[PDB]
Amino acid sequence: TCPFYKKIPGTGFTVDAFQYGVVEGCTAYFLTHFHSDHYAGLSKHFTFPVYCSEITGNLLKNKLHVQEQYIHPLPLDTECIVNGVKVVLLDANHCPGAVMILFYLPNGTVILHTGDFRADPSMERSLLADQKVHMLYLDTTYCSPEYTFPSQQEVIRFAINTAFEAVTLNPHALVVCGTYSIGKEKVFLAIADVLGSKVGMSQEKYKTLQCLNIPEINSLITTDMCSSLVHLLPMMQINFKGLQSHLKKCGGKYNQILAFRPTGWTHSNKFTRIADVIPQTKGNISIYGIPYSEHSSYLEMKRFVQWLKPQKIIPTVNVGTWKSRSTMEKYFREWKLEAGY
Ligand code: NI
Numbered sequence: 167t168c169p170f171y172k173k174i175p176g177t178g179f180t181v182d183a184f185q186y187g188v189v190e191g192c193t194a195y196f197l198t199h200f201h202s203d204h205y206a207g208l209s210k211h212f213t214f215p216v217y218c219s220e221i222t223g224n225l226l227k228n229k230l231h232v233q234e235q236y237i238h239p240l241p242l243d244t245e246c247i248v249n250g251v252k253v254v255l256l257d258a259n260h261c262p263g264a265v266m267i268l269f270y271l272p273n274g275t276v277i278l279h280t281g282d283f284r285a286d287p288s289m290e291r292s293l294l295a296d297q298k299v300h301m302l303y304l305d306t307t308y309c310s311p312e313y314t315f316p317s318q319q320e321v322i323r324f325a326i327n328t329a330f331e332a333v334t335l336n337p338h339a340l341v342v343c344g345t346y347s348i349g350k351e352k353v354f355l356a357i358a359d360v361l362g363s364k365v366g367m368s369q370e371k372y373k374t375l376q377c378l379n380i381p382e383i384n385s386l387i388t389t390d391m392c393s394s395l396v397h398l399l400p401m402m403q404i405n406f407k408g409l410q411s412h413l414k415k416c417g418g419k420y421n422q423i424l425a426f427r428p429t430g431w432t433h434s435n436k437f438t439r440i441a442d443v444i445p446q447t448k449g450n451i452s453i454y455g456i457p458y459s460e461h462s463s464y465l466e467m468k469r470f471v472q473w474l475k476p477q478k479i480i481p482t483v484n485v486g487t488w489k490s491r492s493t494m495e496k497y498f499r500e501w502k503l504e505a506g507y
Contacts, residue, residue, distance in 0.1 A: 171303060171480050174279075176271045177251055181279050181303070184208045193249050198281025199264035200225040201347055208232060217248060219255060221263025224377035225348075243293060256292050258283040260460045261349030262378045268293070278474070279303040280482075285462040285470035294474065302476035306483045307461040309494050313431050314464065315457040316440045322356050324440050325426060325456060329357045332424045333395070339422040341396045342412065344404035348374060349460050350428045355386060357426075358396040366394030392419075401427065406448045413451075422450045428458040468501055475507035 168186040173179075178193030184207035189195075197205060197218040208216070210231040215238055218226070223239040226232040240246050242255045242265065252270035260282040269277040278299050333339050341361070343354040358365045365387045367375075372389050380386070388394055399412065404427045413423055424445075434443075435457055445452040462470070471479070479498050484490040 171482050171485065174269055174277060176273060176275070177269065178249060179251070179269070181267065182281065184212075196267055197222055197226070198267065198279070199258065199261055201261065201282065204281070205230070212236060219263045219265050221378055225263070225374070228377055229374065254293055256289075256294070259286050259289070260284060261347070262351070262380070275300045277301045277303070278476070280305045282307075282460070283462060284460055285466040287469070289470065290473055299474055300477045301480060302471070302474065302478070303480050303482055304471070305461060306467075306481040306494055308431060308464055309467060309481070309484065309497060311464045312436060315431055315435055315459050318352070318458060320440050321456050321458045322352060324443065325353060326356055326360050328454065329424065330360050333361055336422055338420055339424055340413070340416065340420040342404070342409060342423055342425040343396065343398050344401035344425070344427045345371065345398050346401040348378070350458050351375070351378075351380070353426060353428050353456070353458055354396060354398055358386065361395060363395045364388040364393065365396045365398060366391040367398040371398060404453065406451055409451050409453075423452070425451070425453045427453060427455045429455050430459050430461060431457060468497075472501050472505040475505065
């Protein structure tokens with residue numbers, strides 16, 4: 167049974183509610199982005215309308231084999247009508263194709279569902295600037311002040327320099343990058359670009375990246391591992407055992423692996439600067455955990471909410487425990503008192 171924070175009152179609409187079978191009353195199913203906690207239950211057998219971005223649509227079609235007829239892509243930044251209700255899709259600054267959704271209810275209420283986002287001050291000059299929002303359905307993944315992490319630009323700088331230095335000292339080193347979903351592509355793309363290589367990967371992953379409308383992508387990726395010195399692998403394989411095994415496969419082309427695990431937050435953030443980050447090493451293999459986040463930091467979140475001044479906030483993450491809910495409502499009250507709304 168579908169929970170309440172996935173339902174849009176005064177509409178026949180749900181958001182990211184595909185694991186509950188047929189939801190009573192739902193005339194249109196919205197999908198914010200192509201991550202499996204959110205698309206859970208879609209398949210080639212789904213026959214209700216799905217509304218999403220063009221990219222999320224390429225993925226539903228090609229990866230999950232949803233039929234063309236049930237896929238309704240919408241352009242971003244554009245007023246559209248769906249079963250008599252005005253909507254707009256906005257970029258969420260999460261993974262490719264990820265959107266926020268503005269609903270303009272027939273009674274005059276205005277609702278913002280952020281799906282998954284990384285709040286940014288550029289969002290303050292979207293179509294959000296031009297009117298009030300009564301309810302906000304907020305991604306609260308890191309809604310606690312201990313969640314700090316650097317900018318995406320800083321982390322990429324750190325990775326670029328790390329990889330370039332290591333491979334200039336040892337031309338026979340291989341760089342490996344872990345992945346388990348879409349998102350965070352900039353990590354492996356930035357590294358390959360500085361080394362003048364394409365990124366090599368499995369057929370299943372090449373296919374996924376082929377759906378993403380990335381400019382010049384045929385220039386940047388490939389399925390021929392041998393021609394490439396940046397390889398992608400499943401995140402699970404990013405460990406001393408997994409990498410030793412992979413290295414055996416490359417046929418004495420390489421004598422060293424430098425690998426990167428993009429994580430979200432990790433408690434090493436509570437002590438370390440991105441500049442001071444050190445790998446875990448065993449022999450000819452080093453592994454860096456880098457805090458590349460696609461979710462708001464606590465401060466990025468707080469800033470966006472104090473700017474938007476919503477009348478009511480409904481959290482969509484960390485809702486399962488009384489301690490989490492209580493913690494979050496305290497922070498919402500603080501922000502409101504501090505800013506005067
Ligand atoms: Ni997500």
